[PDB]
Amino acid sequence: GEARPVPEEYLQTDPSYGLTSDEVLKRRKKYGLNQMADEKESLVVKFVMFFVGPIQFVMEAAAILAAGLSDWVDFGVICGLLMLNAGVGFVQEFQAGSIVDELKKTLANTAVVIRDGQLVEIPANEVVPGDILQLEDGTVIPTDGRIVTEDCFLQIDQSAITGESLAVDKHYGDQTFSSSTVKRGEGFMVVTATGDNTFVGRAAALVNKAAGGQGHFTEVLNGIGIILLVLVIATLLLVWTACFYRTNGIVRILRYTLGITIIGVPVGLPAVVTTTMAVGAAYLAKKQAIVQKLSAIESLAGVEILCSDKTGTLTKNKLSLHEPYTVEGVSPDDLMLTACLAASRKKKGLDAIDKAFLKSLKQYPKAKDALTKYKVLEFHPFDPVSKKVTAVVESPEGERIVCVKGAPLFVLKTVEEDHPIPEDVHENYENKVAELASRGFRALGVARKRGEGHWEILGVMPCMDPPRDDTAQTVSEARHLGLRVKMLTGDAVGIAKETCRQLGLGTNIYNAERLGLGGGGDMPGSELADFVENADGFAEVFPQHKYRVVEILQNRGYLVAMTGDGVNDAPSLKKADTGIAVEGATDAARSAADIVFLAPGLSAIIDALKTSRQIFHRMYSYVVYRIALSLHLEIFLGLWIAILDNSLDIDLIVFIAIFADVATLAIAYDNAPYSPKPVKWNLPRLWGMSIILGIVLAIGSWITLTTMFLPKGGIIQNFGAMNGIMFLQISLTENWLIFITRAAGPFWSSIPSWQLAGAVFAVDIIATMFTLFGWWSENWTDIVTVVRVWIWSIGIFCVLGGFYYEMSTSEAFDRLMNGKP
Amino acid sequence: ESSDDDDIDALIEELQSNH
């Protein structure tokens, strides 16, 4: 993070001669190339990484167990499931990264340097510290440096770094940054850093540092998987105690252990969750939002703070004019016209100010129509000393008119030096200039003169970063969704405050450096966290301060999304639970942002929020379903093995797992309603609901089983096989539990989608054929027995519906499970 | 000199096309 400072001994390069080729070679050897390390991981390593997870290790162990026990169907199914999961995830993330590699545009970099006393164009990678680089109009600065031309005035656009869409004026001795564009002026700069040492270089270093960090979704999933593994180990301990106490054979013990491990560990949990997230990602891409990391979709569901860059994300990147102040008797059309005649008329080489004036002319038809009729005679461009552009023009009536556009105070002084202004006009002028400066507007005073007449001052033209047309409707819609919008920016406190006031945001914008985000503030940690939490934004924010604010907000338990465009933001994009790169973001920021917007503006964050909440609803429904599944079958089979030393046939257990997984894969397309409030994993409530549902299912299955021990068959009528019947009843109730967990209230309230209903019905049909034809069962079963099983399963399903309704709507149950009273 | 480099009205229309 600390830039290795190039000693000043190496920077005293004579500008008239530059560096020598031998010196170039030495410095290249000592400091390497001017190219950041572009480490991007490997595809095979990533495909392998998909298998590296807590649940995936337990399934690898289970597959090894199946291979050892010669149950090749078990091993083959487990490996097929694992490869399907990894393939789905890898394919989705490859599709996502293809877009990132697609919108890449930055290339054709060539720096013009003084070497051996001659100007030579070299590739941007060959520049070395101490070099003398030529800065021209439009030159993209490749390396950080310090200007060395004494009588030099540069205007350099640093929006890519500090967010400022406004060309910073740079003089002799001022620092320049890589990737900044020289909007005006000519000069020479001595290089001071290269590669990773550059400001952009250090930003990319922080990006590649945070790129190895895990996401909140993954930690929640890992916790669920670890608790399920703990429950499985408890059930295996019970089973093994029971089996030992019967002097049971090792082979029988290992077969039961394989059966319990296959079911109690959620094989398809990562797969179905990733598939739901991938379908949601495709929906977003249709909504013009491209998700890089699927986990970010979950994070964007529970995100409660959206930290947005001011410039390029919340605002536009054009120095747009606002309502002009006019002196009495001066029409706004007249002031627009006069400001325009004091502008360059050449299509090439237009300044930002003149460009904004010309663009605002659309709203002033009289000025537009009058501009063409005036013939420009002489034009004196922006002189930094007098700080005013001047234009001597000839009117269609033959009158010569001098127009001036400069600083409000300089133009006021120019007018005063010719004739005295009324005091009232002077005070109103200065008061409005002060208001505009406080509001952060870059005011531009305007004046004219007709023939030999006196100077007429016309007024002031504000010039600020305009809010994007679709931002207020997207900063109010986000707030309607329980989301708190906080601005972060490098612009001055005043400019950020005015932009917030114009966006409707809060005005409590604090200078980030002064509040201590840099670590130098005496404020205690908890007080700093509270200030960060309640502050309405931060101004003069360096990349490290963005990272610090995001880190503090995350440490307070908030899921934080963040938006930005420059590499400077990228550390906060990757650090935030949901890094959002807006249109026009740099390749580094895009590679750091978890979601990349492909259309201009910040309008696609509300559809992203809704779709993320729908995805979370589907994922939560599936997770509750599967935890209930695991607890149900763990309890049932563990007690069955402990009590009667017998368990459901291993093939039927494998098929139960396959059926549950494949039926749930269709949850990804379910029409889950969106939550109105930001949604979090209420894990204690989730686990309580799943435990109760599992106990109810276990009781139902145990009643069904114990009906078959009677000498007449009980549930069996005429004839039937116990293993097949238990398989059928288990499959039916387990499948139908999904219709229960997916509903926000009574299970009939949300009509099931046709994809999920058809999948569940098909699995029920296939289980029914399995039982009827006795596949991997002792014997066929009578059809009336199957009908009885179906009726019993329907009853258990209604019981589960009552239980889930009561538990879900119960605040008291939630309090009880969460420890509260 | 770059003198015959004009017709800004075209530029006027071109610039605010984002409307």
Residue located via tokens 């029988």 = A252
Strands A388-394 and A463-464: unpaired
Is A309 catalytic? The answer is yes
Asked whether the beta carbons of A559 and A313 are under 8 A apart, the reply is no
Q: Is A431 exposed, middle or buried (0-12, 13-18, 19+ CB in 10 A)?
A: exposed
B16 CA to chain A: closest CA distance, Å? 6
On whether any CB of chain A is under 8 Å from the CB of B14, the answer is no
Phi, psi of A778 (to 5 degrees): -60, -45
Give me the numbers of helices (H) and strands (E) for chain A, helices first please. 29, 25
Judge: B2–A358 Cβ closer than 8 Å, yes or no. no
**Which residues, at least 6 apart from A269, have a Cβ–Cβ distance to it below 8 Å?**
A55, A221, A224, A225, A622, A623, A626
Judge: A355–B15 Cβ closer than 8 Å, yes or no. yes
User: Nearest-5° angle of CA A170, CA A172, CA A174?
Assistant: 50
What residues of A are in contact with residue B6 (Cβ under 8 Å)?
345-347
Q: How far apart are CA A155 and CA A162, in angstroms?
A: 14
Q: Which contiguous run of DSSP H or E holds residue A111?
A: strand A110-115
Fold (CATH) for A295-317+466-608? Rossmann fold (3.40.50)
Phi, psi of A156 (to 5 degrees): -115, 125
B10 CA to chain A: closest CA distance, Å? 9
Phi, psi of A817 (to 5 degrees): -70, -30
Q: Coil, strand or helix: which one is A40?
A: coil
User: Could you give the count of Cα atoms lying within 13 Å of A10 in the half-sphere of its Cβ?
Assistant: 18
| Nearest residue to A547 (alpha-carbon basis) of A202, A300, A69, A90 | A202
- Cα of first residue to Cα of last residue in chain A, in angstroms, is 48
Asked whether the beta carbons of A148 and A171 are under 8 A apart, the reply is no
What residues of A are in contact with residue B16 (Cβ under 8 Å)?
359, 362
Judge: B8–A345 Cβ closer than 8 Å, yes or no. yes
Choose among B6, B9, B10: nearest Cβ to A346.
B6
Judge: B12–A368 Cβ closer than 8 Å, yes or no. yes
Choosing among B16, B17, B19, which should be mutated to test the A contact, i.e. which has the most A CBs within 10 A?
Answer: B16
Structure tokens at A813: 């149950």
Whole-Å CA distances, A611 to A119, A278, A406 = 55, 12, 50
Q: How far apart are CA A715 and CA A175, in angstroms?
A: 86
In terms of DSSP H, where are the helices of A380-456?
408-418, 423-438
| Nearest residue to A275 (alpha-carbon basis) of A763, A756, A758, A707 | A756
Task: For residue A330, give the DSSP letter.
Answer: -
B18 CA to chain A: closest CA distance, Å? 10
Q: How far apart are CA A334 and CA A198, in angstroms?
A: 47
Q: How many other β-carbons are positioned within 10 Å of the β-carbon of residue A61?
A: 13
Judge: A347–B2 Cβ closer than 8 Å, yes or no. no
Choosing among B2, B4, B15, which should be mutated to test the A contact, i.e. which has the most A CBs within 10 A?
Answer: B15
Give CA torsion, residues A51, A52, A58, A61, to 10 deg.
Answer: 70
Q: How far apart are CA A278 and CA A673, in angstroms?
A: 18
Judge: B8–A358 Cβ closer than 8 Å, yes or no. yes
User: Nearest-5° angle of CA A166, CA A337, CA A408?
Assistant: 50
Structure tokens at B19: 């409307």
| Nearest residue to A192 (alpha-carbon basis) of A208, A167, A174, A205 | A174
| Nearest residue to A126 (alpha-carbon basis) of A38, A28, A54, A41 | A28
Whole-Å CA distances, A114 to A11, A120, A128, A176, A384 = 14, 6, 12, 18, 27
For CA atoms A223, A228, A233, A238, give the dihedral sign.
positive
| Nearest residue to A716 (alpha-carbon basis) of A781, A773, A642, A626 | A781
Asked whether the beta carbons of A701 and A728 are under 8 A apart, the reply is no
| Nearest residue to A651 (alpha-carbon basis) of A164, A69, A162, A208 | A69
- Bridge partners for A190 per DSSP: A132, A146
Judge: A362–B12 Cβ closer than 8 Å, yes or no. yes
A375 CA to chain B: closest CA distance, Å? 12
Whole-Å CA distances, A116 to A7, A125, A131, A149 = 22, 18, 11, 19
Q: How far apart are CA A163 and CA A575, in angstroms?
A: 19
- Cα of first residue to Cα of last residue in chain B, in angstroms, is 34
* Helix A54-68 / helix A43-51 crossing angle, nearest 10 deg: 80
Q: Which contiguous run of DSSP H or E holds residue A404?
A: strand A400-406
Q: How far apart are CA A636 and CA A726, in angstroms?
A: 11
Q: How many other β-carbons are positioned within 10 Å of the β-carbon of residue A599?
A: 12
What residues of B are in contact with residue A347 (Cβ under 8 Å)?
5-8, 10-11
B14 CA to chain A: closest CA distance, Å? 9
Structure tokens at A465: 């970063």
Q: How far apart are CA A420 and CA A439, in angstroms?
A: 29
- From the candidates A74, A157, A309, A334, which is the catalytic residue? A309
Residues of A comprising the binding site? 565, 569
Q: What is the DSSP string of A608-635?
A: HHHHHHHHHHHHHHHHHHHHHHHHHHHH
Q: Is A799 exposed, middle or buried (0-12, 13-18, 19+ CB in 10 A)?
A: middle
A396 CA to chain B: closest CA distance, Å? 18
What residues of B are in contact with residue A358 (Cβ under 8 Å)?
8, 11-12, 15
Q: How far apart are CA A73 and CA A70, in angstroms?
A: 9
Q: Coil, strand or helix: which one is A460?
A: strand
What residues of B are in contact with residue A361 (Cβ under 8 Å)?
12
Q: Name the residue of chain B whose CA is nearest to A341's CA.
A: B8
Longest CA pairwise span in chain B (Å) = 34
On whether any CB of chain A is under 8 Å from the CB of B6, the answer is yes
Q: How far apart are CA A171 and CA A499, in angstroms?
A: 28
- For residue A170, the one-letter residue type is K
Q: Which contiguous run of DSSP H or E holds residue A485?
A: strand A484-488
Choosing among A316, A357, A359, which should be mutated to test the B contact, i.e. which has the most B CBs within 10 A?
Answer: A359
Choose among B5, B10, B19: nearest Cβ to A346.
B5
Strands A154-157 and A118-123: unpaired
Choosing among A357, A362, A369, which should be mutated to test the B contact, i.e. which has the most B CBs within 10 A?
Answer: A362
User: Nearest-5° angle of CA A484, CA A488, CA A491?
Assistant: 145
Q: Is A30 exposed, middle or buried (0-12, 13-18, 19+ CB in 10 A)?
A: exposed
* Domain chopping of chain A, boundaries: 8-29+106-210, 235-276+611-818, 295-317+466-608, 320-464
Q: Is A676 exposed, middle or buried (0-12, 13-18, 19+ CB in 10 A)?
A: exposed
Q: How many other β-carbons are positioned within 10 Å of the β-carbon of residue A223?
A: 13
Q: Which contiguous run of DSSP H or E holds residue A358?
A: helix A352-360
Judge: B16–A345 Cβ closer than 8 Å, yes or no. no
Choose among A348, A361, A368: nearest Cβ to B5.
A348
Which region, left, alpha or beta, applies to residue A398 given φ > 0 means left and ψ of -120 to 50 means alpha?
A: left
Q: How far apart are CA A379 and CA A366, in angstroms?
A: 23
Q: Name the residue of chain A whose CA is nearest to B4's CA.
A: A346
| Nearest residue to A371 (alpha-carbon basis) of A348, A388, A387, A354 | A354
Strands A559-564 and A578-581: parallel
Q: Rg of the Cα trace of chain A?
A: 35
Asked whether the beta carbons of A77 and A658 are under 8 A apart, the reply is yes
Report the Cα A205 to chain-centroid distance in Å.
19
* Helix A650-664 / helix A722-741 crossing angle, nearest 10 deg: 20
Q: Is A219 exposed, middle or buried (0-12, 13-18, 19+ CB in 10 A)?
A: exposed
Q: Coil, strand or helix: which one is A322?
A: coil
What residues of A are in contact with residue B11 (Cβ under 8 Å)?
347, 350, 358
Judge: B2–A345 Cβ closer than 8 Å, yes or no. no
Which region, left, alpha or beta, applies to residue A451 given φ > 0 means left and ψ of -120 to 50 means alpha?
A: left
Q: Coil, strand or helix: which one is A95?
A: helix
CATH number of the A8-29+106-210 domain? 2.70.150.10
Choose among B5, B6, B12: nearest Cβ to A358.
B12
Q: What is the DSSP string of A270-305?
A: HHHHHHHHHHHHHHHHHTTEEESSTHHHHHHHHEEE
Q: How far apart are CA A747 and CA A817, in angstroms?
A: 22
Which region, left, alpha or beta, applies to residue A797 given φ > 0 means left and ψ of -120 to 50 means alpha?
A: alpha
Strands A181-184 and A445-450: unpaired
Residues of A comprising the binding site for Mg(2+)? 565, 569
Structure tokens at A518: 């840099």
CATH number of the A235-276+611-818 domain? 1.20.1110.10
Choose among B5, B7, B12: nearest Cβ to A361.
B12
Strands A509-511 and A537-539: parallel
Interface of A with B in 331-360 (CB under 8 A): 345-350, 355, 358-359
Q: How many other β-carbons are positioned within 10 Å of the β-carbon of residue A297?
A: 30
Q: How far apart are CA A799 and CA A810, in angstroms?
A: 17
Q: How many other β-carbons are positioned within 10 Å of the β-carbon of residue A112?
A: 14
Q: How many other β-carbons are positioned within 10 Å of the β-carbon of residue A634?
A: 24
Q: Name the residue of chain A whose CA is nearest to B10's CA.
A: A347
Strands A578-581 and A181-184: unpaired
Q: Coil, strand or helix: which one is A707?
A: helix
- For residue A767, the one-letter residue type is A
Q: Name the residue of chain A whose CA is nearest to B16's CA.
A: A359
Contacts 24+ apart (CB under 8 A), A165-171: A165/A311, A165/A312, A165/A315, A165/A316, A165/A317, A165/A318, A165/A319, A165/A465, A166/A319, A166/A352, A166/A442, A166/A465, A167/A352, A169/A384, A171/A147
Q: How many other β-carbons are positioned within 10 Å of the β-carbon of residue A748?
A: 10
Q: Which contiguous run of DSSP H or E holds residue A450?
A: strand A445-450
Q: How far apart are CA A177 and CA A143, in angstroms?
A: 6
Asked whether the beta carbons of A448 and A327 are under 8 A apart, the reply is no
| Nearest residue to A664 (alpha-carbon basis) of A582, A776, A739, A563 | A739
Q: How many other β-carbons are positioned within 10 Å of the β-carbon of residue A541?
A: 32
Judge: B12–A345 Cβ closer than 8 Å, yes or no. no
Q: How far apart are CA A497 and CA A491, in angstroms?
A: 10
Asked whether the beta carbons of A204 and A161 are under 8 A apart, the reply is no
Strands A400-406 and A388-394: antiparallel
Q: How far apart are CA A699 and CA A724, in angstroms?
A: 18
Q: How far apart are CA A578 and CA A556, in angstroms?
A: 16
Interface of A with B in 357-416 (CB under 8 A): 358-359, 361-362, 368, 371-372
β strands within A180-296, DSSP E: 181-184, 187-191, 289-291
Structure tokens at A716: 């069996």
Q: What are the respective helix, strand and coil percentages of chain B, to the nearest 5?
A: 40, 0, 60
Task: For residue A313, give the DSSP letter.
Answer: I
Give CA torsion, residues A84, A88, A91, A93, to 10 deg.
Answer: -140
Q: How far apart are CA A55 and CA A225, in angstroms?
A: 6
For CA atoms A703, A704, A706, A711, give the dihedral sign.
positive
Q: Rg of the Cα trace of chain B?
A: 10
- Topology alike, domains A8-29+106-210 and A320-464: no
Asked whether the beta carbons of A497 and A441 are under 8 A apart, the reply is no
Q: Coil, strand or helix: which one is A750?
A: coil
Report the Cα A278 to chain-centroid distance in Å.
15
Q: How far apart are CA A481 and CA A189, in angstroms?
A: 49
- For residue A657, the one-letter residue type is A
Q: Is A365 exposed, middle or buried (0-12, 13-18, 19+ CB in 10 A)?
A: exposed
On whether any CB of chain A is under 8 Å from the CB of B15, the answer is yes
Judge: B11–A372 Cβ closer than 8 Å, yes or no. no
- For residue A740, the one-letter residue type is I
Asked whether the beta carbons of A434 and A412 are under 8 A apart, the reply is no
- For residue A557, the one-letter residue type is G
Strand order across the beta sheet in which A175-176 lies: A118-123, A110-115, A132-135, A187-191, A145-147, A175-176
Q: Coil, strand or helix: which one is A181?
A: strand
Strand order across the beta sheet in which A303-309 lies: A289-291, A595-597, A578-581, A559-564, A303-309, A484-488, A537-539, A509-511
User: What's this structure's resolution in Å?
Assistant: 3.2
Judge: B2–A355 Cβ closer than 8 Å, yes or no. no
Q: Which contiguous run of DSSP H or E holds residue A118?
A: strand A118-123
On whether any CB of chain A is under 8 Å from the CB of B1, the answer is no
- Bridge partners for A305 per DSSP: A484, A560
Q: Is A260 exposed, middle or buried (0-12, 13-18, 19+ CB in 10 A)?
A: buried
| Nearest residue to A301 (alpha-carbon basis) of A669, A737, A682 | A682
What residues of B are in contact with residue A350 (Cβ under 8 Å)?
11
Task: For residue A323, give the DSSP letter.
Answer: P
In terms of DSSP H, where are the helices of A103-246?
159-162, 199-210, 216-245
On whether any CB of chain A is under 8 Å from the CB of B17, the answer is no
Q: Which CATH architecture describes the domain A320-464?
A: 3-Layer(aba) Sandwich (3.40)
Judge: B7–A362 Cβ closer than 8 Å, yes or no. no
Q: How far apart are CA A85 and CA A53, in angstroms?
A: 12
Task: For residue A669, give the DSSP letter.
Answer: G
Q: How far apart are CA A461 and CA A424, in angstroms?
A: 19
Judge: B15–A358 Cβ closer than 8 Å, yes or no. yes
